[PDB]
Amino acid sequence: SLLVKKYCKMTTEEIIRLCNDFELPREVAYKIVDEYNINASRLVCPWQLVCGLVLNCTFIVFNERRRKDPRIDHFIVSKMCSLMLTSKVDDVIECVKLVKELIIGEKWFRDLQIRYDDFDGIRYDEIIFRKLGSMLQTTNILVTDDQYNIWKKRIEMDLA
Amino acid sequence: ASSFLDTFEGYFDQRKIVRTNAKSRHTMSMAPDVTREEFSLVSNFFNENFQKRPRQKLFEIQKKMFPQYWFELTQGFSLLFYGVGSKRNFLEEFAIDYLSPKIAYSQLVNSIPCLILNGYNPSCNYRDVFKEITDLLVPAELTRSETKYWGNHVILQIQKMIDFYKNQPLDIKLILVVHNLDGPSIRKNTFQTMLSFLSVIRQIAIVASTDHIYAPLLWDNMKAQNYNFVFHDISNFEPSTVESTFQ
Amino acid sequence: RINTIKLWLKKDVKNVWENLVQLDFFTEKSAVGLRDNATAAFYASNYQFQGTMIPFDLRSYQMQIILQELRRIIPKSNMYYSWTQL
Amino acid sequence: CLRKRIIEEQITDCTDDQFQNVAANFIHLIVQAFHSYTGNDIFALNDLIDFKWPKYVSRITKENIFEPLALYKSAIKLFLSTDDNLSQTYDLSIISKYLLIASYICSYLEPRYDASIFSRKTRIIQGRAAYGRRKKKEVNPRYLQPSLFAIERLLAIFQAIFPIQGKAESGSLSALREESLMKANIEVFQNLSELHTLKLIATTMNKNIDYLSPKVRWKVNVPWEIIKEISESVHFNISDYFSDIH
Amino acid sequence: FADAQRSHYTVYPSLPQSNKNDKHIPFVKLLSGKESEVNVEKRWELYHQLHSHFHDQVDHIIDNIEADLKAEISDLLYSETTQKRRCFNTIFLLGSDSTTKIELKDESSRYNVLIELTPKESPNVRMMLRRSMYKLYSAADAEEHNDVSYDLSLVENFKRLFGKDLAMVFNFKDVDSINFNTLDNFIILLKSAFKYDHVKISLIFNINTNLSNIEKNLRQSTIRLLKRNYHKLDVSSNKGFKYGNQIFQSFLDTVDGKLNLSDRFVEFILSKMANNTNHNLQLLTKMLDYSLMSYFFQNAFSVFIDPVNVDFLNDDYLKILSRCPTFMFFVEGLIKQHAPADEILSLLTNKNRGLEEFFVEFLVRENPINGHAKFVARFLEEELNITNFNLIELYHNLLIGKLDSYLDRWSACKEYKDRLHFEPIDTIFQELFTLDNRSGLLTQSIFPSYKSNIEDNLLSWEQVLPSLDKENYDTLSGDLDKIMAPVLGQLFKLYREANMTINIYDFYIAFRETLPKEEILNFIRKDPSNTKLLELAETPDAFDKVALILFMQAIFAFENMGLIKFQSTKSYDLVEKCVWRG
Secondary structure, three states, X not given: OOOOOOOOOOOHHHHHHHHHOOOOOHHHXXXXXXXXXXXXXXXXXXXXXXXXXXXXXXXXXXHHHHHHOOOHHHHHHHHHHHHOOOOOOHHHHHHHHHHHXXXXXXXXXXHHHHHHOOOOOOOHHHHHXXXXXXXXXXXXXXXOHHHHHHHHHHHHOOOO | OOOOOOOHHHHHHHOOOXXXXXXXXXXXXXXXXXXXXXXXXXXXXXXXHOOHHHHHXXXXXXXXXXXXXHHHHHOOOOOOEEOOOOOOOOHHHHHHXXXXXXXXXXXXXXXXXXXXXXXXXXXXXXXXXXXXXXXXXXXXXXXXOOOOOOOOHHHHHHHHHHHHOOOOOOOOOOEEEEEOOXXXXXXXXXXXXXXXXXXXXXXXXOEOEOOOOOHHHOOOHHHHHHHOOOOOEOOOOOOOHHHOOOO | OOOOOOOOOHHHHHHHHHHHHOOOOEEEXXXXXXXXXXXHHXXXXXXXXXXXXXXXXXXXXXXXXXXXXXXXHOOOOOOOHHHXXX | OHHHHHHHOOOXXXXXXXXXXXXXXXXXXXXXXXXXXXXXOOHHHHHHHHHHHHHHHOOOOHHHHHOHHHHHHHOHHHHHOOXXXXXXXXXXXXXXXXXXXXXXXXXXXXXXXXXXXOOOOOOOOOOOOOOOOXXXXXXXHHHOOOOOOOOHHXXXXXXXXXXXXXXXXXXXXXXXXXXXXXXXXXHHHHHHHHHHHHOXXXXXXXXXXXXXXXXXXXXXXXXHHXXXXXXXXXXXXXXXXXXXXX | OOHHHOOOOEEOOOOOOOOOOOOOOOOOOOOOOOOOHHHHHHHHHHHHHHHHHHHHHHHHHHHHHHHHHHHHHHHHHOOOOOOOOOOOEEEEEEOOOOOOOOOOOOOOOXXXXXXXXXXXXXXXXXXXXXXXXXXXXXXXXXXXXXXOOOOHHHHHOOHHHHOOOEEEEEEEOOOOXXXXXXXXXXXXXXXXXXXXXXXXXXXXEEOOOOOOOOOOOOOHHHHOHHHOOOOEEEOOOOHHHOOHHHHHHHHHHHOOOOOOEOHHHHHHHHHHOOOOOOOOHHHHHHHXXXXXXXXXXXXXXXXXXXXXXXXXXXXXXXXXXXXXXXHHHHHHHHHHHOOOOHHHHHHOXXXXXXXXXXXXXXXXXXXXXXXXXXXXXXXXXXXXXOOOOOOHHHXXXXXXXXXXXXXXXXXXXXXXXXXXXXOOOOOOOOOOOOEOOOOOXXXXXXXXXXXXXXXXXXXXXXOOOOOOOOOOOOXXXXXXXOOOOOHHHHHHHHHHHOOOEEEOHHHHHHHHOOOOOHHHHHHHHHOOOOHHHHHHHOOOOHHHHHHHHHHHHHHHHHHOOOOEOOOOOOOOOEEEEOOXXX
C-alpha cells in the first residue's frame, strides 16, 4: 500500500495532481504545499498527511451537495480508497481525524471554516442553540415548505 | 514538538526529562516592568473596544432561554451556569429584570426580594448569612429539647424549617444568588453543606455561577441529589476585570 | 536444607501481630507514649494520628530489642538458633 | 447444643462422663491447634469456641463418639481455617470499580517506567520511546508505604485503560464523529467525591480539607487484596504489570 | 462602597406598575404567532395537571418503599431471640445511603430511645457518650415526670430512678468516615454493661461500601463477638425493579396511547440507571420531568391530545402535519398499490375535510406497542412471576426486535415468545409524538463532558465568535477582530504544544511573535480615549509592554482556573502544567 511505504518523497506537482483530481482550486493546493514544505521534515509517510489534508478540504467545501446527497460520502471515500490502493479503510479514517487533531487551530484553516461553513458540518446560528441549552434548536426531522411545494407535482400527474 | 498533544499519550510525551545545562535561566526582568496602573488601563481599553460589538450580539443571542430558565425554576430546579468568561453581568441582569416581577404577577402584593452572595470574598462566612435568612424569611426558633449537646444551631433550625414549609403553599417568597461558589472562603465544606441542605425549598431556589475545572468534584452524590443543578453551558470569553481585586 | 513445617497465612498473622504490639516489644517510629499532665492528654483526644488514619499494615513501626541481644539471650538449642544471626 | 444434637441424632447410649470426655478431647483439639495461634490466654479462645463449637456439634454422631479421631477429621477444617468473618464483594457502579483500580497503579509504578506498556498509538512524527526498566527491582513495592501523585495522571491512565465503549460500525459516517472514547464527564468527578467520604481514597489528612488546590498530594489507603478482588469479577487484568519486576 | 465589594449583603427589587396580562407564564406562541393564547392556557393547565398527577404516585411510592424498609427493619429488629443473654443484635445495611429515619416500637415493660451518631459529634469517646446519656435522660424523663451526671452508671442505674427497664438501639449514621480507634475505644466501653440482667441493646451499621472492606480495618478483638448474632440486608433505592418498573408502567399508563420512545433514549437511560446505584430513581424522574418540560415547550401539537381541542384544528396545523414524511411513504405506497387516484384526492389536502377526518381516525389508535409492553409485563408477573427485571430493557429489545432474543435470557415463555413477539415497525406520524435525544441536549444539561466542552471552545473560539463582516467600521475592532486571534486560545495552544514545564520570558516572546505591530498600534490609534495610552503607544516597545500586559492578566486568569501550579516560590520565573485536553 501507500502508508506501509516508509520515507517516500513528493513534489509540488505530484500533490497538485493528487489534489487537482477533485478539480479543487489551486489556492487550497498551495496551502497544503506550504504545510508540506515547512512541516515535511519530521515525517514517517507524507501520503497520510496529504491524504487527510485533501479529505478535510473536500468535507468542508462539499457540504452542500452532500447535505442533499448522502450518496456522495461512499463514492468519495471509495475514490480515495483505491487511488491509494487499499481494501482496508479505517486507516483512512485515522488519516482524517489525526490531521484534524493537528491542523486544528491555524488562522488560515479558520478563514476556510468561516468561508465554506462546516463547523463539524453544521451551521453556527443553529449549533450554538443546539449546545448552549435549548429546545428551540431545529433538528430538521420535519421537512421544509418548498420541498412539499415541489413534491406535489410528482403526484399531480399521477393519472398517467 | 512531540507526537501526541491531547491524550494520555500526549501527557506521557510532554512529561519526561530535560538537561540542566539546557536551562534558559531567564527572567521577566529581561523585559520592561512598569506600573500596574497603565497595565489595568490598557487591559480595560481592550476590554472596552476590542471585542465589544460581537460580545453585545452574542449576549443578545443568549437571551431567549429566560422562559426556559424560569420554567425549569418553576418546578424548583436550582440552576447551574458554567463556561468561560466572567459570569456576573449575565445573572445580575437575569434575575432582577425577569424573575421577581413575572412571578410576582403570576402568584396572584410586592416583588419577591433577594440578597446576593459574593463567594469570592476571602471573608465569606456562613453564620452572617444564616442571620440574614432569619432576618428575611423570619422562621421559628428551637426548643431546648432538640439542640443536642452543642449541636450546631443553624442546621437544626433548618431541619425545623424544611418541615414547616413541607406543606405550605407551593409558591415563592425570595431568591438568593451566589457568585464564585468555589471562592476561597466559601468553598469550605461547612458553607457547602449549608447550601446543599438548603435548596430542598420550593419557595426559593438558586442560580449558580461557576468557573473552575475541578469545582465539580467539590460536591457529593447525596448533595447533588439534594441540589439538582441543571447543567447549562455558557461561555463568553470575557475579561473579568473587576474580579482582579483580590489575587 | 532438608515432622514438617506449616507457615501462617496473613489472616493468621493479623491476629497475633496485635498481641505483639500490646506486649511492649514494638512501637511506632515517631511515637510518643503517655503524656504527663492534663492539657496534653486533652489535646491528644482532639488531634488523631496518621497511624490512626492510615491502615493497619503500613504505619512505620519501631523495635525494642536488637538481634544479638536475643542471640545471646535465647536457648541456643533451638531449631531456629541458626536463624538468630544476621 | 448438646441437648439438641443428642436427639437430632436420636441415640440412646450416653452418660455425662462421656459428655465431659468428648468436650474434653474436643478442647484438647482446640488448644493443640491454636495454642500456636495465641498461647496462654482464655478470652479469645472462649469467643472462637462459642463460634465454632456448634459446627463441631453438627458433625458428631455414634461412630464419631466411638472414635473421635475421624470425628476430628470430620471437623478438622475450622482448626485449619478459623475464617471468622463473613462470592461477591460489592453491589456498585462500574467507574467506582475501575477508577480505584488505577490509583493503586499510579502510586506503585514509576511515572517513567509506564510509557512502554500504557501506549497503543501508531507513531507519525519523528521521535523515540525509551527503553523501559533496564534493571529489575528486588523489593516489590507491594511491601512499601506508597507514593504521591497529582490527579491528571489518573485522568490520563484511566482513559488509557478504560473498557471499550462507543460502538462503531466502520460506516461512511459512523466513526467519523463518534469519538468512541470516554471523556471527562461530571459523573466521574462526583463518583470520585463519593470516595473520599467513603475514605478508600485518602489525601493529606486535614481539618479544613480542601479537595481543590494546586499543591495537594493525594494517595490511597488500601491493600493489594482490595484491588485484587475487583479484577476477576469485572474480568480485568493488571496482575501482569506487577508480577514481573520482583 | 461600590456595590459588589461586600459579602452576604442584600438589595431590594422595585417593580413596574402592572402588565394586566394573562400571558404571565413562560410558554409561548410557537409557529410565528400561529398558535392561540387560549391554546397556551390549555397547555399550561394541562402540564400542571399531569405533572401533579404523576407526582401523586411520586409521593405515593417514595412513601411506599420507605414504609417497606421501615416495616422490614422493625420486623428484623425486634423479637430476634437470643439465648446467651450476653450479646446484642447487630445489623448491616450493606450499602444503604444512610440518611433515612427508623421507628421505635414501645413494648411496655421497656422504654426505648434511639441513639444516633455522626462523624462530627464523635471526635473522641467521652463526648459521644455524653451525647448518648443526654439524649437518654432528657428522653425518658418527660415521659414520666433531680439530676444525675452523664455516665455509664446512669444506664445501669435506670431501674432505681424511674422503675422501668430499657432497650437501646444504636445507629452509627455515617459508619465509614470516622476514627476507628475512637470507635474501638467506644465499643469496648459499651460492652462494660452486660452484667445487670435487666437491659438489652442493639447496634446497626448503616453501611455504604462493604463488610470485608472494613471488618479487617478494625481490630479483630472487636470483631469476634461481632461474629455472634448479626443480620444482613441488600439496601438501595431500586430494590429488584419492584418499583422502578412500576414508575415506568405508571408513566406508560398516564399518557398511554399518545407517545413512544426510541432505542437510543431507552438505552441511554438503561445506561445511566447504573451510574449511581444508591440514588437511581430520583434522577430518572428528574430528567423525565425535563423531557416533558421540553416537550410541552416545543410541540405546538401539545393541545391535540385533549380531544376537546379537536374542534380547534386550524389550517396551519393541517399544513405542517402534512410534512409527516411517513405520511408521504403511506401516500406513495398507495400510489403504486393503485394506478387510479380516487381515494387520495378524496382525502388529501385538496379537500381538508377528509384530512382532518383521517387525523382523528388514526389519532385515536392504541399505539399497541405500549399496551403490548404492558400486557407483556403482565404475562411475566402472572406466569414468570418476576420482579428482578427492568421494563425499560424490554422496551429496548422490542424497539430492536431482539425482544425474543432477550426473553431468550429467561427462556421459559418460549412456547409464547412468537405470539408475544411484537413485529416492531414504524407507524405513521411518528415524527411529532415520540421522544429521543437526537437534538443532543440531555447530555448537554445533565451529563456534560465538562472540560471537553470547555476546551472544544477554548480551542475553536469560532463556535461562539460572531462570524460577521459588515459592521466593522462602527465598532473599533472592525479591522482587528478579523485579523487578531484573541489572547486566550492562542495562549492555550502554546500551553498545550509546549512540554510539561514552561519558561516565561522565552515563552512570552514565542507567543509574542504571533502578533501584528503596526496593526495593533493602529487599533490603539483608533481610540482617542486614554491619553495615558496615547503617550504610551508613541514608543515602539509599547507593543512589547502591552503584549506583557495582556500576557500578565491572561496568565493571572488562567491560574485561578486550575491550569497551572505556579512553581518555584521565591523564584516565580517558570511553571508546570497539570491540565491536559481530551
